[PDB]
Design a protein around this nucleic acid. Sequence first.
RNA 1: GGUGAAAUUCUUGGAUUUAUUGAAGACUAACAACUGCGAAAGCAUUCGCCAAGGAUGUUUUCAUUAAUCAGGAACGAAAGUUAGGGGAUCGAAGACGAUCAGAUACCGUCGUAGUCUUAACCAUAAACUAUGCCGAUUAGGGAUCGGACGGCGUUUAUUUUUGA
Lengths: 104, 81, 135, 61, 232
Amino acid sequence: VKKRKNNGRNKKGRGHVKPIRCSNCARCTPKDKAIKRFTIRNMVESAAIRDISDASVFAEYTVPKMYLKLQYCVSCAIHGKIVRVRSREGRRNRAPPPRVRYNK
Amino acid sequence: VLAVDLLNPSPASEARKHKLKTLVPAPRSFFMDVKCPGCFTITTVFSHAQTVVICQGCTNVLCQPTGGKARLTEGCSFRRK
Amino acid sequence: LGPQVREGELVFGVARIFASFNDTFVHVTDLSGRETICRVTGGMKVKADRDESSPYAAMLAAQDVAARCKELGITALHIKIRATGGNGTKTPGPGAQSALRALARSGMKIGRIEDVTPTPSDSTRRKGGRRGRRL
Amino acid sequence: APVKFVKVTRVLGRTGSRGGVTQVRVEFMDDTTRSIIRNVKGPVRENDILVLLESEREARR
Amino acid sequence: VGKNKRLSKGKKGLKKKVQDPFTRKDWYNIKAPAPFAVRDVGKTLVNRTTGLKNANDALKGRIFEVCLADLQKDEDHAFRKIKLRVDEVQGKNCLTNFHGLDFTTDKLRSLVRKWQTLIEANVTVTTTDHYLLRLFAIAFTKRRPNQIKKTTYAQSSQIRAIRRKMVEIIQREAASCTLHQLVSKLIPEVIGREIEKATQGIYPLQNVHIRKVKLLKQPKFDLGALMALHGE
RNA sequence: GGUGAAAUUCUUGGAUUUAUUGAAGACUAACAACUGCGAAAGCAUUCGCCAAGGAUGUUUUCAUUAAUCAGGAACGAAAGUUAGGGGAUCGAAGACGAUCAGAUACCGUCGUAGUCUUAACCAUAAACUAUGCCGAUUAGGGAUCGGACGGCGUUUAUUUUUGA
Ligand SMILES: [Zn+2]
Ligand SMILES: [Zn+2]
């Protein structure tokens, strides 16, 4: 039986695609099959910003950000709880989850 | 739908179909007479000419070929004959 | 002993923090990179060698840098954090942020934070094989 | 040692593998601007008073 | 860890006698070329002059990283850093001139985004002064205010037209200039704004910049030229 | 250094770390997508030269010149084979350190053929859409790539026609 209509790959209209290296176990997987996450964060955590802020010599200062793109094989994706198993009917839903914008 | 008169389509509905998919095929091209400002002659030019057309007198260009219908020189006028 | 200067002015240094996932390095040089002023690693402070990367060890190693560099006359630092780089994780280790605070709290001045991790445009083959570490 | 005194203003859940440990947010009660996160072992109420030996460790989450 | 050393000093060795090597160091000041606003940029350290080891030989091949914000006293130029190479040493003073340019790492990563087109080109050029130096360029596609379509992509034929236009502009601007003249054009970003006007017809192409400049060859030292810009 | 924790290994004959410079070979990050091309295998840095191809447009030209094919022929990833060049990185075989009742393995430090290229062989893959090729008809919808046609505006240039 086919578990997924797209074979869980997202590759139709071509024959080959170069692989990539997993960011955790350094495995080789096709680029279209890997799970990709883009992350934007600050250099320092929010509790430490005040100590840096008042120790500067430039009056008001803005700590820079850091930009990373991590990408995993499926075996490392669901062991680190990046994604998890869904139900049979809930599998066919590709909308990104609604991030909480009120936080109680 | 389920009851249609296929013999008498509206003229508006036939202006949108492909040139070959109508009830009877018919071209949508035409010939035209171009008035060169420099001279007083008249030349018959196809609407979809693939070659640069030169007028008989004073030897001036009148149109430039392209992918579809040739574009005329800016300082020129034409009538559909 | 130290640079002669008026009381208003302050002299600058640069700190190069190398924080991997196995150890952390605190290194202070002059304005250029040629001359090293002080350098202490996280392994000098801890005695169990599984805590060389612990955030606690970075704080202790960072504190005596400020003490040791205080009498040299340098009063301000530039900061350049870097990860392993190359084929590595490119994510700074746990001790990267612990050391930075200890310089600020100790009384030293801070300016111009930056990240200088080296990234390849197209790298050679990476260690592990095609199947990865299967544990 | 320059020991500091802190006071608890709100409690934020109970951590630990077996629920022994509790996590609280304290206030330094001398510089009202500053506020950090700490970990405590015993039962804690609001307006409780704690003594802190070092004030640079903080805690996860 | 204290109790891991096994070989220690090695096959056979003995402890040292004299320590604290910082008692013999000296401090020097660093100056800046003519176009920049502020001249003092910091201090440097070196061993004291002695027999068999002159101090000036060690202060002739050093370079320094100074942010453009400090030199111009302006926080707008907070993402560009340039290098200064020491040439001559007066009494307790080091003289420097231009040695390159480069963006900061964080500014460049913020520019690149998905569903856009990245265009980049490079070309070598030489000035009237026989300096061989290379320039890099970068640009991105620009969205339209009333656009509804999700992605803004240019056709690869259009990309080559823009790439050809970049090379032509760079050569023309640097054709008749000196190294001092060229630097005076980098800090007001004349090249970027001139490129944008020319490529307007092909495609909008927001965010034109000169990514970095590095030099490859140098002529004779010509000490007379260095003193012209310094000591004003 | 490396690991869940350790050891083998390198070190005041200055290890690890810091800045400048040089040589060699391999590879083209981010942009990169339910997007493009090719008979399939496959193909991603710039520029110059050489021949080839699909779609669209057309009041050009020939007039059945067509479909599928037993035998037959061209191309055909990776590994492997024969002679030269090259040999940075990874790493079959091999040698050690741990774990374990045992461990010829999973983990760690080294490391030969190979990995790259020129001239010739080999003809097999879950070579997969597990779905042969030509032709006709059958239901609604919104996205997207290439060409043409129509239109109200904005933007913009030695600016119009074009491009967005
Ligand atoms: Zn993995
Ligand atoms: Zn005429």
